[PDB]
Amino acid sequence: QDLTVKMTDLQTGKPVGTIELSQNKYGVVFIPELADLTPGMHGFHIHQNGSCASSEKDGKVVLGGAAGGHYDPEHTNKHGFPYTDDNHKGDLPALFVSANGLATNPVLAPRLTLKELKGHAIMIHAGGDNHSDMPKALGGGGARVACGVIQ
């Protein structure tokens, strides 16, 4: 009953690994098994649409823009922590990438359930995430680098 999600690099078009999702007494667990990522902490979020295609914006291209914004079932219109209820239910803890470019440190999302995740897409950004909309919106994750649809 556990889920496996294939992740692809939006830039190169090549796969960077897989993320396994599981449900437990305390929430959903995201177990990463990725590679070819830049070291550091990465913005890690569940997005609205179940797609990783591109989108257009004022004449420019947005890799993984079809996924839309962050998963916000309660229409909170705010970005925040994984343990605060007044923000995107899709706000996951940041994803850590080792010096060798690997990601295998599991993360927990207390406000989520497996059933509701299907049809949505997991997203990995280039910048980090300070879990706020200040001083940079959406935690400063910036561009989208890796993406995967949860089927």
Residue 146 binds Cu ion (CB under 5 A):
no
- As measured in angstroms, the least distance from the Cβ of 96 to a copy of itself is 6
Task: Say which residue the tokens 């649409």 belong to.
Answer: 49
Residue 119's binding partner, choosing from Cu ion, a copy of itself, Zn ion, none, with beta-carbon cut-off 5 to 8 A by kind? Answer: none
Site for Cu ion in 9-68 (CB under 5 A): 45
- As measured in angstroms, the least distance from the Cβ of 131 to a copy of itself is 8
Residue 94 binds Cu ion (CB under 5 A):
no
CA distances from 6 to 60, 99, 100, 135 (A): 27, 22, 20, 32
For residues 11 and 30, give the distance between their C-alpha atoms in angstroms, rounded to a whole number: 23
Task: Say which residue the tokens 């919106």 belong to.
Answer: 137
For residues 89 and 79, give the distance between their C-alpha atoms in angstroms, rounded to a whole number: 9
Output phi, psi for 102, to 5 deg. Answer: -100, 155
Residue 101's binding partner, choosing from Cu ion, Zn ion, a copy of itself, none, with beta-carbon cut-off 5 to 8 A by kind? Answer: none
Strand duo 107-109 + 15-24: pairing: unpaired
Residue 144 binds Zn ion (CB under 5 A):
no
Under 8 Å between Cβ of 107 and 32 = yes
**Which DSSP symbol is given to 15?**
E
- As measured in angstroms, the least distance from the Cβ of 126 to Zn ion is 16
Chain residues that interact with a copy of itself, rule: CB under 8 A: 24-27, 29, 40-41, 81-85, 93-94, 96, 98-99, 105-106, 108, 110-111, 131
Residue 69's binding partner, choosing from Zn ion, a copy of itself, Cu ion, none, with beta-carbon cut-off 5 to 8 A by kind? Answer: none
- As measured in angstroms, the least distance from the Cβ of 89 to a copy of itself is 13
Footprint of Zn ion on this chain (CB under 5 A)?
Answer: 70, 79, 88, 91
